[PDB]
Structure formats: structure tokens, C-alpha cells
Design a protein around this ligand. Sequence first.
Ligand SMILES: Nc1ncnc2c1ncn2[C@@H]1O[C@H](COP(=O)(O)OP(=O)(O)OP(=O)(O)O)[C@@H](O)[C@H]1O
Lengths: 102, 106, 107
Amino acid sequence: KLLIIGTTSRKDVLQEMEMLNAFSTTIHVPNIATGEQLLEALELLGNFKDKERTTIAQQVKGKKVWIGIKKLLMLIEMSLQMDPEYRVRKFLALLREEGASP
Amino acid sequence: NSGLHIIIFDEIDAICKQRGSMAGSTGVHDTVVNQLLSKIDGVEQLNNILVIGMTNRPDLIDEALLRPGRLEVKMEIGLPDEKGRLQILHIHTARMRGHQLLSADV
Amino acid sequence: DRTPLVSVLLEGPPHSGKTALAAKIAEESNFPFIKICSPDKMIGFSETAKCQAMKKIFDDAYKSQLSCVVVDDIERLLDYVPIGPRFSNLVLQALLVLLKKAPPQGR
Ligand SMILES: Nc1ncnc2c1ncn2[C@@H]1O[C@H](COP(=O)(O)OP(=O)(O)OP(=O)(O)O)[C@@H](O)[C@H]1O
């Protein structure tokens, strides 16, 4: 017997190259897209404080959230390096900069 | 009335020129490969030899070497299994048992 | 007696089982000499290797009195791709000349 597992980020080009017709199944991996999900992920990682988490939830309730776990980690790293007072503000600032809209 | 002489090769695929299909360019002039072949047959008729060949890539063997009157028996030696592994360990570990040097725990 | 060569091209949408029907038709001929040139047995080759392999197959086929050769998956064989398009003109020129060559007399 045998089994093969593939991976890519640009399905359209593969479709155009009549290659998808060779594979036998497809799966989707969506990005985080909701605020409550972001709060849950932050909680699981456990890097933000109680009042910190409350302020984040207050500011991010707009629901205009769309990011990739990888980039979330990198942003968290960048943010954490400030002093305790300006960490949340800077993190929210970067988050706002990356205002994607699929 | 002569005895039997056995000559063992190895990776006979090395003396092949039919392996350049995938940019192999590992075939020198077929001359060299012709000569060896014409030592297992020809106008001369040696009758006291046995040649055992060994390889790893069965797909790149020159076809002229797999015909009647030449190397004409193929066989496969697959990976060992549970019983084979047990027997091989028992074989390899007879010394320490023979001298009690092995711990009884194992 | 006045048509020593014949040809036929089977076609159909993907996954309809053309290969199996071709194989069955070839098998039910009772002919003495049959072959199947399948792409799989040339992975990673260079166009020259393909050409030489086909040359050899047809050359051997010439030596009998009756035969049948099943060149399967002609599309892939000619390194196709939609974008471009792209391919190997050599193989095309080869097959096109070969599909018309009559064998020696009386075969
Ligand atoms: N009556 C039948 N007609 C066609 N195919 C059949 C029939 N009965 C069973 N099959 C099965 O259908 C399958 C056809 O596979 P085949 O490779 O011929 O399809 P194909 O269209 O040539 O494939 P591909 O498009 O990938 O080249 C085989 O598994 C064959 O055994």
C-alpha cells in the first residue's frame, strides 16, 4: 500500500496546470477570523494579563480580524519587547496596521 | 575433469552503459562491456565456471546479459521480519551467553 | 493484401477506461508479437532517450510476420502542459513520420 500527502498555498495555479485532477481529495485550512478565537488563542498561549486581556477584547471587538498563526507569533514577539506600560498599545497598533480584508 | 571456479562481482550495474537515459552519462564505450560478456560465451566454451552477480538497481542492467546461456536466474532478498530479527540477534549474542558476560535481566 | 498498415485512435473523457479496452482488444488478437509502450517506464528521461526507445521497439516489431503495438497515453508522452503551450517537437516529428512507414515487403 501507499499514501501521499501534499501541501501548497496557491490552488488556482495548480488547477490551471491540470494537476489537481491527479490528486484524489482536498482539504481546507482557514485562518483565524474572529475576535473570540484570538482571545482563546492568547489564553492558551498565556502571555497577556487580566486587565491586558480585557483591554484587548474591548479594542478588538470590531471583528475586523484576519491573521495567520505564524505572523501572530512574530507580532507577539515584537510587541513583548517594550516596557510593560506600552506593550498593549504597540501590539494593538501593529495589529491595526495589518488590516487585511479577504 | 577440472573443478569449479566461482567469481563474484558486485554492483555489476557499474559495468553498464544503459543507465544514461536520465542524464546518467555513466556508460563508457560499450567495448568494455562487450568483452566481459564474450567471456561468458563465444567461440571458446569454458565449462568449469560459475558467476554470481549482485546488484541494487535491477532496472539498469544491460539487457544482453539476461538471455538463455548467460546469467539466467533472478531472485530477491527482501528485508528481514520478526522471526529473522530474533534469530539474527540470537546468533550475534552467543558469545556473552557462552561466557555469562550478558546480564540475566535482558 | 493491398493495405499492410492500419491505424486507429481511441478517445474519451478522463477516467472512462480507454487503456483497459485497448489492452483487451490487443489481447484478443491471438497475434504472436504484442507490446505496450507505457510512459511510466521512462520517468526522468531525456527526449533523446524516448526517441531511441521507440526506435528500438518499432525496429523489433518489424522482424515478425504479425504484431500489435499499443502506445498508451500519447498526450502525456509528448510532455504537454496547457500554459504556453510547451512540448518537445522532436518526439512529435518522430511519431508522425513513424505512423506512416510501411514494413518490409510481405509483413
Ligand atoms: N467494462 C469496463 N470498461 C472500462 N473500465 C473498466 C471496465 N470494467 C472495469 N474497468 C476498470 O476501469 C478502470 C479503467 O482504468 P484506465 O486506466 O483504463 O482509465 P483511463 O481513463 O485510461 O485512465 P487515465 O485517464 O488516468 O489514463 C480500470 O480499473 C478497469 O479495470
